Design a protein around this ligand. Structure first.
Ligand SMILES: CS(=O)(=O)c1sc(-c2cc(F)cc(F)c2)c2c1[C@H](O)C(F)(F)C2
Lengths: 112, 107
């Protein structure tokens, strides 16, 4: 059996430099990482090199428009390999940017 | 200073990040299954219900709301909740609301 859409969705929070400030525990059963080992690390460290430029542009669009839908991209999984994701990022501003909220969906087939 | 929560369109907490303890004093298990309006000051309840109704119509745009939240330490804390709906585009499941809740100054 394979996981559905909801079970393949995890939330993450980032500072404006892309560093993780929060990550939902659901990332562990999907990508192998424990949230605590992601804190303080730039999201960019996990992008597959072939998606890095597209992710730079998606971050630039997010910073100017306040919200963005990324294209399909690869994130390095803990024990090797890359998983395909799509993220909806949203900037939380002080009505000045405070942080970025990501809703991350794993596109790849994940068992269970 | 802040915590994330996920709600159904009625306002029920369906996900609460552990930073809620430092922000409002409650454990996530004390918030889950309860409605956000149950922790809201009676003067702000209708504004909070109207804001949850409207965030659904705004297409993923952020809707902010300031209201008084009753902490576990029996104080009315000013909270600024920035909310937006999320609906997985590969599905037609009912949208849910994502919130970032911060204790802010009314000054
Ligand atoms: C809005 S976006 O450009 O689509 C996007 S995707 C993503 C991300 C989040 C994860 F949890 C894992 C991962 F590999 C990348 C992030 C972003 C933003 O640039 C970020 F700074 F907020 C970091």
């Amino acid at each position: 059996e394979f996981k559905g859409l909801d079970s393949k969705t995890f939330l993450s929070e980032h500072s404006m430099d892309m560093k993780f400030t929060y990550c939902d525990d659901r990332i562990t059963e999907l990508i192998g990482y424990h949230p605590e080992e992601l804190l303080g690390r730039s999201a960019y460290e996990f992008y597959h090199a072939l998606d890095s430029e597209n992710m730079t542009k998606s971050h630039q669009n997010l910073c100017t428009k306040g919200q963005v839908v990324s294209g399909q991209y690869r994130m390095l999984a803990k024990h090797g390999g890359y998983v395909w994701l799509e993220t909806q990022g949203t900037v939380i501003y002080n009505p000045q940017p405070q942080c970025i909220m990501c809703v991350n969906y794993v596109l790849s087939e994940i068992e269970k | 200073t802040r915590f994330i929560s996920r709600h159904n369109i009625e306002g029920i907490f369906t996900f609460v990040d552990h930073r809620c303890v430092a922000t409002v004093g409650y454990q996530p298990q004390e918030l889950l299954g309860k409605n956000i309006v149950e922790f809201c000051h009676p003067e702000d309840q209708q504004l909070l219900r109207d804001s949850f109704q409207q965030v659904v119509k705004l297409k993923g745009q952020v809707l902010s709301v300031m209201f008084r939240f009753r902490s576990k330490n029996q104080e009315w804390l000013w909270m600024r909740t920035s909310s937006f709906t999320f609906q997985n585009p590969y599905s037609d499941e009912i949208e849910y609301i994502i919130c970032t809740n911060t204790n802010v100054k009314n000054s």
